[PDB]
Amino acid sequence: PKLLNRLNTYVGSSRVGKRFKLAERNSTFTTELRAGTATFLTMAYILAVNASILSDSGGTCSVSDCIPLCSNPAIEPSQCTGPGLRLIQPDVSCKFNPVNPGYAACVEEIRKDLIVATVAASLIGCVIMGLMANLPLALAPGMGTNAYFAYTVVGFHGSGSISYRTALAAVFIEGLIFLFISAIGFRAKLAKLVPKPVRISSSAGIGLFLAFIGLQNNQGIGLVGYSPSTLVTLAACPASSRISLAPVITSANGTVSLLAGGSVSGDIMCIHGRMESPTFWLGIVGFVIIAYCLVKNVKGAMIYGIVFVTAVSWFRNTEVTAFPNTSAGDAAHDYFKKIVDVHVIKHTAGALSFSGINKGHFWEALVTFLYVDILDTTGTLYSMARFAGFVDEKGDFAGQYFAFMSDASAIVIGSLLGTSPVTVFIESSTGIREGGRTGLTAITVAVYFLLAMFFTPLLASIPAWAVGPPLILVGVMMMKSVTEIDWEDMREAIPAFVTMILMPLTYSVAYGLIGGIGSYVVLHLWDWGEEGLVKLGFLK
Amino acid sequence: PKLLNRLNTYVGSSRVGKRFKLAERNSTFTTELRAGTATFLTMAYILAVNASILSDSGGTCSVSDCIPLCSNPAIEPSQCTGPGLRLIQPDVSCKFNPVNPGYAACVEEIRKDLIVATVAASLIGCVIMGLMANLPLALAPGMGTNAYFAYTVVGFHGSGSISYRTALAAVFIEGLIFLFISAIGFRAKLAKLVPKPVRISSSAGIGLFLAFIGLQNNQGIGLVGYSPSTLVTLAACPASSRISLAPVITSANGTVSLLAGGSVSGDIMCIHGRMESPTFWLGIVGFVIIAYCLVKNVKGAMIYGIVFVTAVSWFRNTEVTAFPNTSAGDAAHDYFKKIVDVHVIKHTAGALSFSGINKGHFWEALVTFLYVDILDTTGTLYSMARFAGFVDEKGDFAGQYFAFMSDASAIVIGSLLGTSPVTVFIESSTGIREGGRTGLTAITVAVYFLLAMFFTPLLASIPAWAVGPPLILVGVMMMKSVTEIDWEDMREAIPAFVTMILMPLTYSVAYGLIGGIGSYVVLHLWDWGEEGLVKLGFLK
Numbered sequence A, B: 001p002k003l004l005n006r007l008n009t010y011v012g013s014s015r016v017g018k019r020f021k022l023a024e025r026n027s028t029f030t031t032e033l034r035a036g037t038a039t040f041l042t043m044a045y046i047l048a049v050n051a052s053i054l055s056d057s058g059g060t061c062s063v064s065d066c067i068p069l070c071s072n073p074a075i076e077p078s079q080c081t082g083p084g085l086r087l088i089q090p091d092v093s094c095k096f097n098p099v100n101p102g103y104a105a106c107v108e109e110i111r112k113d114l115i116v117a118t119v120a121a122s123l124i125g126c127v128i129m130g131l132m133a134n135l136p137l138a139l140a141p142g143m144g145t146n147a148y149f150a151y152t153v154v155g156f157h158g159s160g161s162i163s164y165r166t167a168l169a170a171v172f173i174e175g176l177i178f179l180f181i182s183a184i185g186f187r188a189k190l191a192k193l194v195p196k197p198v199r200i201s202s203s204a205g206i207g208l209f210l211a212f213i214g215l216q217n218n219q220g221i222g223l224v225g226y227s228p229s230t231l232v233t234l235a236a237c238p239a240s241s242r243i244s245l246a247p248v249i250t251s252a253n254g255t256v257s258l259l260a261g262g263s264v265s266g267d268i269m270c271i272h273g274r275m276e277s278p279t280f281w282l283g284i285v286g287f288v289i290i291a292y293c294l295v296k297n298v299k300g301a302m303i304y305g306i307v308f309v310t311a312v313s314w315f316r317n318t319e320v321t322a323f324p325n326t327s328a329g330d331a332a333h334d335y336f337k338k339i340v341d342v343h344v345i346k347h348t349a350g351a352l353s354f355s356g357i358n359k360g361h362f363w364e365a366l367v368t369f370l371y372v373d374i375l376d377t378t379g380t381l382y383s384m385a386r387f388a389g390f391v392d393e394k395g396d397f398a399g400q401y402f403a404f405m406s407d408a409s410a411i412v413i414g415s416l417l418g419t420s421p422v423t424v425f426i427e428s429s430t431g432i433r434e435g436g437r438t439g440l441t442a443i444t445v446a447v448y449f450l451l452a453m454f455f456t457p458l459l460a461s462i463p464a465w466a467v468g469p470p471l472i473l474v475g476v477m478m479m480k481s482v483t484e485i486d487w488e489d490m491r492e493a494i495p496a497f498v499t500m501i502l503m504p505l506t507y508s509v510a511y512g513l514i515g516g517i518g519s520y521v522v523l524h525l526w527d528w529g530e531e532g533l534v535k536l537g538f539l540k
């Protein structure tokens, strides 16, 4: 007969076929391969997004890599010898606008390291899940945790309260704690502490957070800029129409004096030319492409949008180029002209530090990660077990124990390689809908990730207006959880609204969670006291 | 027979009782009075909120009221005569921080004028509705239109693109157009142009906008401040820990130079002492009070929260005082020591100007108002007609014609007195639930508004941390519209999300509407073209 039939029969009757229980689950070999291909096509946008987001945090390097500069910018630093010409020693301000050249070079090196680390963590997680749990699930660094890790815990170019290495240690300890909790069966009971309205709306809140990042110049397409009155207005003017802000001291007559050592922002204020940014309109075109591909059920919509926007930007002498006519642009183009490369992680691997373990901020991060991974992983896996028909009458699908242990182990391993926590992707559903039932789907996704490695030069050249619409559409899709909040009941509607709006406005996830929980406790104090009084016996 | 029974019988058998159809609708006199009292108690927060919001726009006065200042702030301006001491002529920067004393005095005068105008517009609208339509509905200046009029169309202290008088003319013409449209029966047809997902989510969007205003230092309790990296972080530090920002020019070596004539912001950047602002915690206490009063179905919850927070602030030598130890504070206290006053509108009444009618921004405002009033009034009235049992099998409740004409006339009259458009309040439902069926409820609310006049000194002394939680809770209650969007369908979910998130982030309502409509058209182009091709006959 057909050669595929012979191959399927041979594999099913073999020893590895019985190991993976192919016959008992009604799927042979090619259904597994097709399901793995579909899942990889649906989740491949993480390869660009995660590396960009994590690289924005600055990585391991610090002020020690800034180089001394000349008195005038027109003279090369090594030729700054003459009357009144001296070398300026670097300070913290070298990390921020205008950025010192050495810092930017290090940041590019960190970006390559983080691409490789993302690929390796996804591969190891998928293989561990496939071999141990024997489930068709794919693991990769999560999205909300990426944004929270980069822009809040560590901050832009290390402007946060915790260094990169200490945050890696926090992720490591969180993974170990999650493993220990899942191994003794206290995970389900611990999941009950979070009140219901906070437990749901939080997801929506994160989506809003992500969307806001996509509407930002540092991070996405623009369209939102600084305003002296309202703090936020309509941006998206060309890069030559933007200026920075600096703190000043005023008086009661009208004088102003610049404040020494103050933080200078990026080019966030727009003077003229609104709605004229070419990169903004290129990002809009990519957004439209992804949205149409999502409506018509095309797999890999985000891949297509990102690839279109990136390929348009690879030309050199345009207004939307990714390789500007500078030294950094020329170096980036030179690395890009190499199509394939085998990059070895140099700075990011094995970069843990336990110095800040006694700080109060550290723990605020460690708990927050622990919350998200406990909820998300609990929410996703069971949902997946419903699509594959594994759930019995008791609500258990056998391999849940090893599924949770494998997720925790993947988190630990990813922390060792220098990336944000890894989780199970919801996109795995698209593989289950195609017929994947065993762990061969995870192995197939792992092989695809291995082949996605070796393309670091192509993945390291993706501009900010290409990582923009994917975040917005991810927020759109996360928004669907609001339909199960009872907005008629104030005692539920107030905490959910507080969580949802505080996540993007304070630009933090922990603050939204804290506000929601505090509001819930305050609003339920009276009822709890009345119940306690009735129970004790002072009241009827 | 009790005396109340005799009074009810006498009124019901009288001529005015037959005029208002008291007997035919099963309500006599005291049910009408009680329903009016309940409605007024539920809607009385507008008396403070609307005046504060509209006064933040600066009113009619301009740079011409700034007074010349001395070379040093320590010398009184009229004694600035000596070596090198001159008078600085005012410029536009006198309107912004630091604010010229004459401008602040004028703004206080405008605040009194706007309190009186708000009361008068509400009274006239209620009387016109009660006498003509004969419905138990109360009219007052709307909330989203207040915020849009003040902070977007006119801008803070006149920093927008349209002056106050031109915006009043826009409101006037919008009211006239709405009257003409409703009189010829094209209102229902015109209401169908807005796509459904935009037509719903817009309400939720406005709520978010309002909540953001309540989390702002200019406008509410604080908690959200400027950030050099993310533009927005956790504020709410004491007023002595805040500094301003000014635009600068950088170079490639590290120098910075202040830019001449740039806009200086308010005290928005926080250096230290986060979560230590006493006014922030007072606002939180007021928020909690209103939240419990809302949970337990207490009428006038917002009144109680506002009154508590305001009464705490009336003491003079504290950190939460509304009368600081300055000249402006002393003048405010002197006006407050008067309990009752008869204020006559001096600047705001009859201040229309038709100069900017050929500007493109003008029309962008005029349409936007016209949208909101067409939707909101259509959404509310019919809903009210369901609670009172007026809707027949055909969907009409007889007096809808005069109801819409009365709403339009009230809009025009309010525009003449110098306020944002007036609409029907949803809070009127609380009066219908109590038994109100005729127009005597509107007359009762009008009498209550008339007696609420004469208390301008008390209403003019309400601080910003008292107008804060009401806006947040109004946003919470408007948020309930999201449950009727199908978030599973991308072709609907994308426009709704775009509208909802663009309203508060760009800090404008028109931009959210434009984005939503544009996204809807773009996403439906392919389907519309395919349908048209099938209809014409080129396709099967």
Ligand SMILES: *[C@@H]1O[C@H](CO)[C@@H](O[C@@H]2O[C@H](CO)[C@@H](O)[C@H](O)[C@H]2NC(C)=O)[C@H](O)[C@H]1NC(C)=O
Pocket: A071, A072, A073, B251, B253, B254, B255, B256, B257
């Ligand atoms: C960096 O280079 C600029 C010149 O490009 C220096 O600016 C001097 O000081 C102000 C501010 O720009 C200018 O008005 C002067 O014209 C500049 N003087 C000269 C001789 O160019 C700036 O001083 C340099 N940075 C430092 C720390 O010296």
Ligand SMILES: *[C@@H]1O[C@H](CO)[C@@H](O[C@@H]2O[C@H](CO)[C@@H](O)[C@H](O)[C@H]2NC(C)=O)[C@H](O)[C@H]1NC(C)=O
Pocket: A249, A250, A251, A252, A253, A254, A255, A257, B070, B071, B072, B073
């Ligand atoms: C306005 O008032 C200040 C004093 O309050 C005057 O003095 C200046 O103070 C700032 C610091 O706040 C210094 O940077 C300036 O060097 C001071 N200038 C002088 C001449 O002493 C200030 O001069 C006043 N401004 C004007 C235009 O008169």
